[PDB]
Design a protein around this nucleic acid. Structure first.
Ligand SMILES: Nc1nc2c(ncn2[C@@H]2O[C@H](COP(=O)(O)OP(=O)(O)NP(=O)(O)O)[C@@H](O)[C@H]2O)c(=O)[nH]1
Ligand SMILES: [Mg+2]
Ligand SMILES: [Mg+2]
Ligand SMILES: [Mg+2]
Ligand SMILES: [Mg+2]
Ligand SMILES: [Mg+2]
Ligand SMILES: [Mg+2]
Ligand SMILES: [Mg+2]
Ligand SMILES: [Mg+2]
Ligand SMILES: [Mg+2]
Ligand SMILES: [Mg+2]
Ligand SMILES: [Mg+2]
Ligand SMILES: [Mg+2]
Ligand SMILES: [Mg+2]
Ligand SMILES: [Mg+2]
Ligand SMILES: [Mg+2]
Ligand SMILES: [Mg+2]
Ligand SMILES: [Mg+2]
Ligand SMILES: [Mg+2]
Ligand SMILES: [Mg+2]
Ligand SMILES: [Mg+2]
Ligand SMILES: [Mg+2]
Ligand SMILES: [Mg+2]
Ligand SMILES: [Mg+2]
Ligand SMILES: [Mg+2]
Ligand SMILES: [Mg+2]
Ligand SMILES: [Mg+2]
Lengths: 509, 205, 85, 62
RNA sequence: AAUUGAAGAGUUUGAUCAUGGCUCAGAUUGAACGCUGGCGGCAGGCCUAACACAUGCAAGUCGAACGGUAACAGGAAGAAGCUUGCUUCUUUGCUGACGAGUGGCGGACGGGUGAGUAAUGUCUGGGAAACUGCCUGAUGGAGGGGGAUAACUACUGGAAACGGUAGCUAAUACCGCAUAACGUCGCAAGACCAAAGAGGGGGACCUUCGGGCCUCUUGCCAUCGGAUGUGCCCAGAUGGGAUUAGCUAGUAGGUGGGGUAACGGCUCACCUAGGCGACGAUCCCUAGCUGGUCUGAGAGGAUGACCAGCCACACUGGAACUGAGACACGGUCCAGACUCCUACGGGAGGCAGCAGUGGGGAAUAUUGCACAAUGGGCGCAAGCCUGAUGCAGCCAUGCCGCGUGUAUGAAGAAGGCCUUCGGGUUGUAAAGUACUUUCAGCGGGGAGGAAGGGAGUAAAGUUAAUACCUUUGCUCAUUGACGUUACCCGCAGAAGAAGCACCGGCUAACUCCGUGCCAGCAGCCGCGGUAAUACGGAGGGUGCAAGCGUUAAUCGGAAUUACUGGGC
């Protein structure tokens, strides 16, 4: 990074909102692709960057879905981009997910331009959007707050001409700083694991430069680049600070995002990469000692000790950190759920072994079973379930938890009976003659023996016998007989209370 | 491949002068010979029968400044040669280049002899030699090159070199600043206080 | 993979159809020899022997039957035709 | 199998797979192995100075 | 001159001597982990999942085999925009060459792997009943004809792969005739079998004026040999278990027929009732074997990484064709498992090649450069191809060498530690003073790995020829991937470079403090319950050194499977 060379670049733009403002539609129409609703779920659960060539100059587009679950993706996408776009619908207005995107725009000090998504529907009006978002300091219009609004059809494909112009201008009015040659650096969009290609990452390069021989260092991972891939293009020789290019040949799957810096030699970068691992490992053992010692007692003070374990491996690195945060949101005091051994991709022997030791569900956002993986899963009793969307996953884990509960909320008496004129039996030691005043007496239902309102003894009936009949059930106001083991003293005037036991069941929330 | 620590601590531990303190002044005067090798070295000198074999191994190695792996190769080479193994052990150590530099009196100490040979000042039969472990054979002339000639380091050593034994097996010369190795040294010409039967025993087990 | 010996593959296919036809006609002359030997015809045995003699030795010179196999046919069939005769 | 944990104190429990070198020392009934401290996810001995090779203790900067 | 060399200790008991096991000192490894880490040379580097695979590359090459213009490099002709000297754009295989196709040779070599195989194997020593391209020695033919066909056109079935119908065209493709022993088949007389031309140049009788012919180079055909390789057979040796003792119908042998290049139950019909086996058959478990490596005084034991020989295997199972050689790693056909493509009819793929990824596992690497060199494949040669090989990158994995200063220096400093507070120790260590510049860093110079090949000449050898070609001199241009090569010289300045285990005995090397059967050490006997040289820290010390230590594996010690060499 020497020479202080300043060259203009294509602005990187991210788009945020409440789900359903047709945020994806804006991109696909510009891209003339329409990959929307071609994928499972009908919505975009993943992040990707796509550069297009349109007058004037060059521009690239980045998009992140807006959901309660993706706390991290929208936070990282804002700070990386020079310009942020916020989609808003006149029918939808403002929503708590959209205001969440407002904070990401201001805290990242990134200038913002917006577009009205629906001009097609007659019940949709712009004035509603402007005024209601007026209250918030963001999105002023012609009040001297320099922000500009755009009205697009998004289905109609109507300009757009204005939105595009604003974006170009907004990037034009601010000085665009970059360099064509120098020390390469940037951030990682999304990383995942491939079977043939190996571990890969999608990287935005702040200073644009690359070469097959150049050594690159991402986080605590290091390595030489074997090959370069850009979007549909299978191979690219050179990559500029503007257009993003998937990086390949790194040692292992890096963090979901971080600062990447190339180096001259790999040997010099080996010690640095190992140094970052030591710190990350030291804090890992540090946070491990605290959480265990935090209770300051050998066990839990109450009965919440019952827990459920899960095993998760997702193909993409961006999800495992992001959805886990949303997976810890559904956690409750009663039933505690924890993730064990989050994977970078697929499935493996040591992963199936991990679920073998402790009973757990093995789930993946997207995964396929390995040849060696099937043998283990099919042999021992386990469960392999893969889910296209995170919503179907977040629901069933809760379901697993709700079932775990075992609550019986009813201890209603089945019958109440008073005993009189005790008889002697060899087997039980006593038979207390009874007369049921209320309800029906049953065999295996538990009883409460009490005298003078206090309980002298407790137990469960072993034998209910009237005469030589030995019937299993006795109604009220019918002469009845009773005996039980481990009850020594039968006195008249006391009353025995029999009660059935039932379980209400439980739900999670 | 070298010690670098205190040379007199090696001499004090053995209880015999290793001639690493040769330099300008010699025959100690200031010594404290044995008596406190360490902090609790004033403890009684009674030592095991195994330890005295290991002690003599260090006595021979610390003079010439040879490491155990490098020394094992000389013992392995001394075993395969004809005649006595103990006599050939010290002969191969005496056949080192830096030791021949010390005997003729170019270097003041044995450590300084390796130091001077390391900088490629010494040439044998015309050709330069960096490595101090170079094997010197009969009829091999040795001399200092034109660069770094007649300096105060080498000149001071050759003056006081006449005061020592002056070995018979090589010619001192020191007029034109050269030397000649005539033949392999005899058993009487070396050893005496250091023993060959003690050092050799330890590698048998 | 489109690689090297796909030219030679169709040549060996052509050579198979060529050699299989020439080996088939070669044997049919030998097949008429034992027809006379199994029957009681001494004249047709020697007549069929003189028919196979030119064609069978010609295949040995070409280098398909491989020399001594062609020689072994005449060696065995000489002893059979003069057994009854 | 079962294995002794050397060093003073540990964070070892439940999950986080650790290295096991082996070797037999006799104290508990039937213990033929030893765990490696300071490897994979197993924490080293804190504030130890002598014998850094054993127990996976790094050299302090001085 | 050449397998010339042999260590024990600790531990049963109150103590001793035997017997006896366990443990340790030794060396070594295709190593790993922990801590630490400067450079160079050489060697080694998926031991587990014979688990599965993305992309590129790993075998092509000849116009001097023959039809040919599909590209573009000239020449030639013609038509044009015009500049009177040139470009532009359609024809033309005349040519330097060459896409695709036909044909020849090599895809059976090189490379990788240790799943099978306890004997169609390997090792060692023999035998006769066989083949063997390319390469050689010996003696002769290379005469004269015919019929196709790919490519390319005219259509047409197809998404793709890949065809179909009907014409056209050559050959070192293919098929007849003639020619025929020294060959094959026979007791003999006899019967019967082959081919190909192409290229360089040229006087003479010369051509239907393609060239005959003379001559040189190369290739084809037949036979007897040489060499090499391959097949087959016999003997011996090459794991464990008797808690496997009986096992065999083509099983053992003969005769006859067929079969293999060749002997043979190799395979059939018939006949006989044998074969193997306590000297371990059969069955089961495990495993490539050997030259050797490791250990050992030797005898042995363990082991089969790299290097090299042989065998087997090439996604699984089975089969055959082409060919001198395969029952074929990157060939074909079929079935099975599984990946990709598709308009859903139907095709395409096999990293136990080099890199590399998924994954296994404690763990082992770069999707590199170059045919410069060695050695193959093709070719007359140039030259092309060559993940073989030569090199680089990576990892202290191993071996070896060097450096991280040297010399002087008492104030035996300061500080730390101990102290019976006299001091001792750290300690010539540091500071200071006097010197040197290796290996790194920077700037210069510069071997060897390179001989050939190519273009002109001279003489000699072939020859009708001072053509041509080959061989041998001479001269002139050159051909280095590695390579900021090795190495040498100069510059600056001790500058950039020492950690690790252990200190109760065994076993080289001791005190204080903290903790008090708590926390912990341990290879073995054992230490700690308030003087711990055994724990933890500090000081000091010892061993070793870019390594160190722990664990795992093998042998030694272990005369503790004892043949050498032990007892009852
Ligand atoms: N009427 C109308 N509907 C529109 C318009 N633009 C988009 N839509 C609707 O929006 C839907 C597509 O939404 P989409 O872009 O996938 O939403 P999203 O960007 O994935 N949401 P998130 O970012 O939270 O994941 C379509 O079904 C379409 O009906 C428009 O201009 N008019
Ligand atoms: Mg809505
Ligand atoms: Mg390290
Ligand atoms: Mg060394
Ligand atoms: Mg026969
Ligand atoms: Mg190629
Ligand atoms: Mg061609
Ligand atoms: Mg014709
Ligand atoms: Mg022919
Ligand atoms: Mg004959
Ligand atoms: Mg004929
Ligand atoms: Mg002809
Ligand atoms: Mg027979
Ligand atoms: Mg095996
Ligand atoms: Mg022995
Ligand atoms: Mg097969
Ligand atoms: Mg054949
Ligand atoms: Mg793994
Ligand atoms: Mg002091
Ligand atoms: Mg240097
Ligand atoms: Mg040269
Ligand atoms: Mg030469
Ligand atoms: Mg001791
Ligand atoms: Mg210790
Ligand atoms: Mg104490
Ligand atoms: Mg023994
Ligand atoms: Mg005995």
């Amino acid at each position: 990074d020497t020479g202080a060379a300043a060259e203009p670049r294509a602005p990187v733009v991210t788009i945020m909102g409440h789900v359903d403002h047709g945020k994806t539609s804006l991109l696909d129409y510009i891209r003339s692709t329409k990959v929307a609703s071609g994928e499972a779920g009908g919505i975009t659960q993943h992040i990707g960057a796509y550069h297009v060539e349109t007058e004037n100059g060059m521009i690239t587009f980045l998009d992140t879905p807006g959901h309660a679950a993706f706390t991290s993706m929208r936070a990282r996408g804002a700070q990386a981009t020079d310009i942020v776009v916020l989609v808003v619908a006149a029918d939808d207005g403002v929503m708590p997910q959209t205001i969440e995107a407002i904070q990401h725009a201001k805290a990242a000090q990134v200038p913002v331009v917006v577009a009205v998504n629906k001009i097609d529907k007659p019940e949709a009006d712009p004035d509603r959007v402007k005024n209601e978002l007026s209250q918030y300091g963001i999105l002023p219009e012609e009040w001297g707050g320099e922000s500009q609004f755009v009205h697009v059809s998004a289905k109609a494909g109507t300009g757009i001409d204005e939105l595009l112009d604003a974006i170009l201008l907004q990037a034009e009015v601010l000085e665009l700083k970059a360099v064509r040659k120098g020390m390469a650096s940037g951030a990682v969009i999304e990383s995942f694991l491939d079977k043939g290609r190996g571990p890969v990452a999608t990287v935005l390069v702040r200073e644009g430069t690359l070469h097959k021989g150049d050594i690159v260092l991402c986080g605590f991972e290091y390595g030489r680049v074997r090959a370069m891939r850009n979007e549909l293009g299978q191979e690219v020789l050179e990559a500029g600070p503007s257009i993003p290019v998937e990086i390949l040949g790194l040692s292992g799957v890096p963090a979901a995002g971080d600062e990447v810096t190339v180096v001259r030699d790999e040997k010099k970068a080996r010690e640095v990469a190992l140094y970052r691992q030591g710190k990350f490992r030291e804090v890992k053992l540090a946070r491990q000692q605290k959480s265990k010692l935090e209770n300051m007692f050998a066990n839990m003070t109450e009965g919440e000790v019952h827990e459920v374990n899960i095993v998760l491996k997702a193909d993409v690195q961006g999800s495992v950190e992001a959805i886990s945060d949303s997976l810890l949101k559904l956690s409750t005091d009663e039933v505690k759920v924890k993730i064990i051994g989050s994977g970078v991709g697929g499935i493996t022997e040591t992963d199936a072994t991990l679920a073998a030791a402790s009973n757990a569900i093995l789930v993946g956002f997207n995964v396929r079973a390995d040849a060696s993986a099937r043998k283990v899963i099919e042999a021992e009793s386990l469960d392999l379930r893969y889910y296209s969307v995170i919503y179907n996953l977040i629901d069933e884990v809760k379901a697993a938890m709700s079932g775990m509960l075992s609550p019986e909320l009813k201890q209603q008496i089945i019958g109440l009976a008073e005993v009189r004129d005790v008889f002697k039996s060899p087997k039980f030691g006593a038979i207390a003659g009874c007369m049921v005043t209320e309800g029906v007496v049953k065999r295996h239902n538990p009883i409460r023996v009490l005298r003078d309102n206090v309980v002298i003894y407790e137990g469960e009936l072993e034998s209910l016998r009237r005469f030589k009949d030995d019937v299993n059930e006795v109604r009220n106001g019918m002469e009845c007989g009773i005996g039980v083991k481990n009850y020594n003293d039968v006195r008249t005037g006391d009353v025995i209370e029999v009660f059935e036991i039932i379980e209400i069941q439980r739900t999670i929330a | 491949a070298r010690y670098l620590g205190p040379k007199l601590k090696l001499s004090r531990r053995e209880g015999t002068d290793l001639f690493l303190k040769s330099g300008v002044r010699a025959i100690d005067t200031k010594c404290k010979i044995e008596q406190a090798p360490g902090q609790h070295g004033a403890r009684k000198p009674r030592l095991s029968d195994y330890g005295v074999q290991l002690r003599e191994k260090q006595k021979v190695r610390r003079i010439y400044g040879v490491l155990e792996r490098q020394f094992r190769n000389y013992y392995k080479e001394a075993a395969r040669l004809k005649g006595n193994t103990g006599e050939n052990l010290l002969a191969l150590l005496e056949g080192r280049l830096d030791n021949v530099v010390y005997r003729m009196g170019f270097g003041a100490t044995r450590a300084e002899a390796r130091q001077l040979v390391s900088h490629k000042a010494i040439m044998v039969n015309g050709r330069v030699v960096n490595i101090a472990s170079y094997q010197v054979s009969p009829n091999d002339v040795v001399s200092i090159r034109e660069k770094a000639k007649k300096q105060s380091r080498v000149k001071a050593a050759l003056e006081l070199a006449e005061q020592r034994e002056k070995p018979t097996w090589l010619e001192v010369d020191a007029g034109k600043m050269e030397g000649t190795f005539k033949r392999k040294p005899e058993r009487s010409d070396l050893s005496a206080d250091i023993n060959e039967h003690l050092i050799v025993e330890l590698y048998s087990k | 993979n489109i690689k090297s010996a796909k030219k030679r593959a169709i040549q060996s296919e052509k050579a198979r159809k060529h050699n299989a036809s020439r080996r088939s006609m070669m044997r049919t002359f030998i097949k008429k020899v034992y027809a006379a030997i199994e029957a009681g015809d001494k004249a047709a045995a020697q007549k069929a022997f003189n028919e196979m003699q030119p064609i069978v030795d010609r295949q040995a010179a070409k280098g398909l039957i491989h020399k001594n196999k062609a020689a072994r046919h005449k060696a065995n069939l000489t002893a059979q035709i003069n057994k009854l005769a | 199998v079962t294995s002794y944990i050397g060093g003073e104190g540990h964070n070892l429990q439940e999950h986080s797979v650790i290295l096991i070198r082996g070797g037999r020392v006799k104290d508990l009934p039937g213990v033929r192995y030893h765990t490696v401290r300071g490897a994979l996810d197993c924490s080293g001995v804190k504030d130890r100075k002598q014998a850094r090779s054993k127990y996976g203790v790094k050299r302090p900067k001085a």
